[PDB]
Ligand binder design. Sequence first.
Ligand code: KDW
Lengths: 117, 117
Amino acid sequence: AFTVTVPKDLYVVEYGSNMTIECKFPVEKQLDLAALIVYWEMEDKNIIQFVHGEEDLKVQHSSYRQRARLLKDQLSLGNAALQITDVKLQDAGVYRCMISYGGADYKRITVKVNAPY
Amino acid sequence: AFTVTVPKDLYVVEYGSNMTIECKFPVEKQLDLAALIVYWEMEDKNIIQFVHGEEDLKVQHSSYRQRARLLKDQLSLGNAALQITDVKLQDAGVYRCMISYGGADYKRITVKVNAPY
Ligand SMILES: CC(=O)NCCNCc1cc(C)c(OCc2cccc(-c3cccc(COc4cc(OCc5cncc(C#N)c5)c(CNCCNC(C)=O)cc4C)c3C)c2C)cc1OCc1cncc(C#N)c1
């Protein structure tokens, strides 16, 4: 059965830093963008919406715009990686990564931000 | 863009009655069982795991085992229909139906159970 996995299901980070939430999925030989879908959401806020290689700035929630990107370099090697930069205390919470690729699966990732000084 | 739709996001049903939760996806004609995944969750309790035709009925909350069924007769009309016979008060809460077909989407449905006397 297709099982997405999370190396680290608990990221503690510092206010203002850079964070990279990883989700991994199985890839045999190369990666087929046809039949790959990657969706990242926090508390129902749309963070990453990647469908057969197309993405649209218009659908990103306003608190994640210009900070939250899906790294395409890791994707090619089975790693849906969310990278939030300039982290706010408001980014603390449970995130879900939902992948369709051979089959489907999702995983929760928890994040706390410790506060400045 | 592939979108899942609920004719109703909230159902009020009576203790002891039968209830069908419906969530619809688009279908051209020949249902490609090979391209279809239907997953039903209730508070993260795996209810339905239906993947390329086969149900891993191993993992199915015994809370619903033999009472929570995927009507695999409406799927062909683009209706992932969850039916729970003999509704207990425990069946009250938020259900989530996740479909991967052309692409992918999910929707929440709430169930309020009442028991008039
Ligand atoms: C204009 C337009 O309206 N368009 C789109 C509009 N929205 C944009 C959008 C746009 C897009 C693209 C998307 O994609 C999702 C997506 C992406 C990728 C995959 C899936 C998906 C599809 C089918 C099934 C499943 C999940 O199956 C399973 C889950 C399972 O269980 C996982 C699990 C269970 N329990 C706890 C955890 C944890 N932790 C994990 C298991 C069993 N396990 C694995 C197997 N065995 C082992 C060893 O594990 C099996 C299946 C098949 C998923 C995630 C989904 C839904 C979702 C989208 O909106 C979501 C959304 C946003 N806001 C509000 C609501 C509401 N209401 C909904």
